[PDB]
Amino acid sequence: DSKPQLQRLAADADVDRMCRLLEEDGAFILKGLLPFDVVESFNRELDVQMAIPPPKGERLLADKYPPHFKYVPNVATTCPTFRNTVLINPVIHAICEAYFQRTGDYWLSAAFLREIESGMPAQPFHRDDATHPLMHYQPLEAPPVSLSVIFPLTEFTEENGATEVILGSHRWTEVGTPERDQAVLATMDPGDVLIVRQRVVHAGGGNRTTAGKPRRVVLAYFNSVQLTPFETYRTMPREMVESMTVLGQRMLGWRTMKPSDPNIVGINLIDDKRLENVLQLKAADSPAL
Amino acid sequence: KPQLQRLAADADVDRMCRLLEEDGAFILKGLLPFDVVESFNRELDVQMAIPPPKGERLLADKYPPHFKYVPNVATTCPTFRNTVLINPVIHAICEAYFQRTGDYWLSAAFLREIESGMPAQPFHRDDATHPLMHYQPLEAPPVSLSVIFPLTEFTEENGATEVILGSHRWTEVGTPERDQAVLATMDPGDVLIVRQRVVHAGGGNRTTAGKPRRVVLAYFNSVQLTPFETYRTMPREMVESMTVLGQRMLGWRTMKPSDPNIVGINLIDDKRLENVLQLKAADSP
Ligand SMILES: [Co+2]
Ligand SMILES: [Fe+2]
Ligand SMILES: [Fe+2]
């Protein structure tokens, strides 16, 4: 509309340009990154998880909310489509490599599903700096250590709560209490992807539809390997791990990684050796590399 | 000039905390009894006697051959794993120090041996392993603590650690003189504790004879920060023989950064890692 909008880019768009949008606007959308069949396969895998009856024991997040809370943690362990296809998408990683150039290696801190039902209110505007509170004190100019990647799995509309993003707001000193009309809407089709810079002020739009159609989203956080993964994928069976590509294994914390100089050795190692060597980890695309 | 303060092992933790914010460092006298120091040294002797490896060594291959180093001592030295790592005074200090940031764990603990004729290190801050630390404001909650265990005598001759008191308040390292620093001269069993941002240097070893100076360095970091050393390949039997505190230090349990993190970190299936693993411990039901 009137205000400058989120730019929607083709999957083959220029990475330098995407990197610049992140620094100027703080966010952008990749159009039709995931084909519809991938999206639907992912959705069915998620349906299976959500249909599982509630467990007997403790659930750290879920126990904090009423029983109608819809959440699937660490989707990489239970959704093969995410693990084998979405997680290792080459466009996503081209962006990450450029974005994290100053900080070095990155990996997956978390990827999880939320569903926002009809009649739910919008989120307060905020920054994604709560999981690793030290991020709250990092200056704007410092090398970024986190990137938010948002996957709509149903339509995002003005009505059902499309993500509200305030362009340029990563340059603000604080969040404050911004008006809703300061934000623009990440309206999207399933298969699109929203990419959001560290420190950008934003809010989930809730869902004001009344027809019972929930809005589904998978949120993935790619962080500097300096930062401890929220979700640990260390209990994945070896057969599952070795079925992944090297990149996948790197994302899920199964390999030694490298923060930027002046760390000149790396991180996540043991016996002064690479973790994957100590584990004698095979990978699906080891013959080609 | 002001020297490093030497405190009895049973001194009041509030005083220790005060010293870290004012001086940036202090020494605990006789924290580890002689038998602990001796068994630990014997265990390290075993590792040091093990022949040089064939394959790549990530850290060691970057330095000259006189580099003497034993990585992740917790996996090979029961005395560190069962006694030193879980010392209650160290953790009283950590709990006070990390109050603002939340839970902490072990990023690394390793041995270095410094031979005769080695020069002192350049003055520096310990902000290289996790470079994001370089950009954290002075006022922000600390996310790292250096704990230094002399395993041989630290003398003015053999390279006692050089610490510049109050330098954590400096904007940058600059080009400090050696006489700006004071020496952490210590006996085995003592412990040197050094705050984030404190400018310091290993003292090398100016002796011309005798056995090298032996030191174990442990870095305790906010659980927000990825451990340099990962202890995830430890055998289950070894892990379960440890106390809950030990398991928490070595990354085998779910941990909790301060609010506004209200769930925790290092979890899976929306459960605690130790519950998913059905982890036993020496001191849990
Ligand atoms: Co002078
Ligand atoms: Fe958010
Ligand atoms: Fe140092």
UniProtKB/Swiss-Prot annotation, chain A:
**Keywords carried by this UniProt record:** Dioxygenase, Iron, Oxidoreductase, Virulence
The catalytic activity of this protein is classed by the Enzyme Commission as 1.14.11.38
Query: What enzyme category does the UniProt record give?
Result: oxidoreductase
The cofactors it requires, by name, are: Fe cation
Q: Which GO terms describe its molecular function?
A: dioxygenase activity
> Do you know which InterPro entries this protein is assigned to?
Phytyl_CoA_dOase-like
Highest taxon of source: Eukaryota
- The residues responsible for catalysis, as annotated, are 65
Pathway(s) per entry: Mycotoxin biosynthesis
Pfam families recorded: PhyH
**Coiled coil stretches, renumbered:** none
GO terms classed as biological process: verruculogen biosynthetic process
Task performed by this protein: Verruculogen synthase; part of the gene cluster that mediates the biosynthesis of fumitremorgins, indole alkaloids that carry not only intriguing chemical structures, but also interesting biological and pharmacological activities. The biosynthesis of fumitremorgin-type alkaloids begins by condensation of the two amino acids L-tryptophan and L-proline to brevianamide F, catalyzed by the non-ribosomal peptide synthetase ftmA. Brevianamide F is then prenylated by the prenyltransferase ftmPT1/ftmB in the presence of dimethylallyl diphosphate, resulting in the formation of tryprostatin B.
Subunit structure as annotated in this protein's UniProt entry: Homodimer.
The protein's name in its UniProt record = Verruculogen synthase
